[PDB]
């Protein structure tokens, strides 16, 4: 009768190991009665008890008491600052006001805009879209709330994990390794590194130069860092903490969409540019996943291809479901033991000569001095700094390993049999697995407690059950969800869907210090490659791309086109924009609801936007807008593309 109160309490219990020498009882058995708990240390949702004719509610107060004693005995031990971190105390000037209760705040070192895209935003307002009703995106955070986010998210002890967990995860990894690559990775040349790197990658708190300036002038400083790490010598490793969307919140690398920024923590933490180059030059093959050795890693997968790729798998099951990975604030849940596990996997693939390098870097990452923009210093215990070069690889491998383990331990499938039973996909902590429905439902109901014990608590959901998709287009991944379209050649395919209100908001605004038609047409094109299923988005893009046919698109955003944008679309999408005859009617109604709830459009909006495209397309000539099938069928005019190619930006 009171079994949900016990499932709750078992998620506040310290994770323990298998006690095969006493009775290990589930939350169900406890809600029955005549079971008296003898310790609060939980293992696969079970604790140690002895039958002793006790009332069920009596046994709850005892578990609650054992939990409350255990917490007031592991409070907050003042931890020894490692010697290799001592230098930061030598930079302290004033005393701290972070008021951290779980990490050292050893003081404070000396002190050291959302705007509209004018053309895109005009096209929206002309057809009656109310911009001030759209959701705000890319919000900045002041210093008072910045320090509060530190206190809320970062200022915590390392998660307790199941004893022996990381040996199991290494067992899972042994079922997934690629032995033809073992001990084979070496550092890359400067030239290869310089190809794939944003030269405006941010400088650390004590750095003045950005990535490109350091490449042009201080390569010796980077090789000096590499040398010291190679031999096992400490470096002055620190990370800098800035709020999301700050000036220094810059991606070293091309991102597959704005969803990567959306998923960043509120507190961004990154090593120095010199230090980031050092790690990247040596660990390139691992951090960039070249080749991909993480199963199901979609980090390199274009957003316009991902769901077609997944549907292929979904079709091979006889009753597939998809179970979502939904860890709470993943980066704050990464433990020292997690990092050492990833250190061990890296050592598998890297040549022996880099193992001391990896050991020493990993040691620096387990206790990280972090300097805030305003000078406040805290000493982070474990966790992931979002700007670390290893964030995508290191999180993706840890996510895969932890999710396979949790799935296998809930269902009974041996680790070496996971690949005959389920398919997995990850982007850092984001992802899901597809499997047959009964396995999927099993995993979904037991995964929450197994994942809490493995140190990755899940977001608190309706009945402590992991989210299950029972139809393909209910999957969520990379902030998007599948939507089917119909082409004029009697085929169908999937595109990345999301709320129309969200797309408008992201398309309409930017953070700027770059505000010009060149940038906006690059945005319009980048969005057309993803959202051409959405007729409102499709037509705003065509209108924007019709502006100043002689100005070329900018290269600072996700994609751009060389030559004809309509032909560039067909190059990567595989059909002509003109061949899209139908978007799935049910899914589109779902993704359009918030337009009506927020009042971001009116009953005329679609008509006015269609009427604007028609008015432009009837005129004699060659008009981009006539690539829209319904516009062309009303103007009587077709568009004849010239040559054109899609490319990545920066």
Numbering used by the authors: 13 to 124, 132 to 532, 536 to 672
Please give sentences taken from the publication describing this entry.
Compared to the RdRPs of other Flaviviridae representatives such as the NS5 of the Japanese encephalitis virus (JEV) and dengue virus (DENV) in the Flavivirus genus and the NS5B of the hepatitis C virus (HCV) of the Hepacivirus genus, the pestivirus NS5B contains a unique ∼90-residue N-terminal domain (NTD) that does not have notable sequence homology to any other viral or host proteins. The global conformation of our CSFV NS5B structures is consistent with the recently reported CSFV structure with an RMSD value of 0.9 Å (95% coverage) between the reported structure and our representative C-682 structure. These structures together reveal that the NTD adopts a globular α/β fold with an α-β-α-β-β-α pattern. The NTD interacts with the palm of the RdRP core intra-molecularly with a mixture of hydrophobic and hydrogen bonding interactions. Collectively, these biochemical data indicated that the RNA synthesis fidelity of CSFV NS5B is fine-tuned by its NTD through the intra-molecular interactions with the RdRP palm.
In contrast, deletion of residue 673–694 (construct C-672) in the C-terminal tail resulted in apparent reduction of product level (compare lanes 2 and 4). Further truncations beyond residue 681 led to apparent reduction of product level (compare lanes 10–13 to lane 6), suggesting that the N-terminal half (residues 665–680) of the C-terminal tail is likely required for optimal de novo synthesis. The structures of the C-682 and C-672 were solved at 2.1 and 2.3 Å resolution, respectively, in the same crystal form by molecular replacement using the structure of the WT as the search model. These three structures, each containing one NS5B molecule in the crystallographic asymmetric unit, are highly similar with root mean square deviation (RMSD) values of 0.4–0.6 Å between the WT and two C-terminal truncation mutants for all superimposable α-carbon atoms with 99% coverage of the resolved residues in the structure of the WT. Therefore, all three structures are not sufficient to provide a structural basis for why residues up to residue 680 are essential for the de novo-mode synthesis, but are valid for assessing the NTD–RdRP interactions described as follows. Different from the observations in the WT BVDV, full-length JEV, HCV and the recently reported CSFV RdRP structures that have a canonical fold optimal for NTP entry and binding, the CSFV NS5B ring finger bent toward the pinky finger, partially occupying the template RNA binding channel. In the chromatography analysis, the crystallographic open conformation C-672_AA and the C-672, or the AA mutant and the WT, had consistent retention volumes.
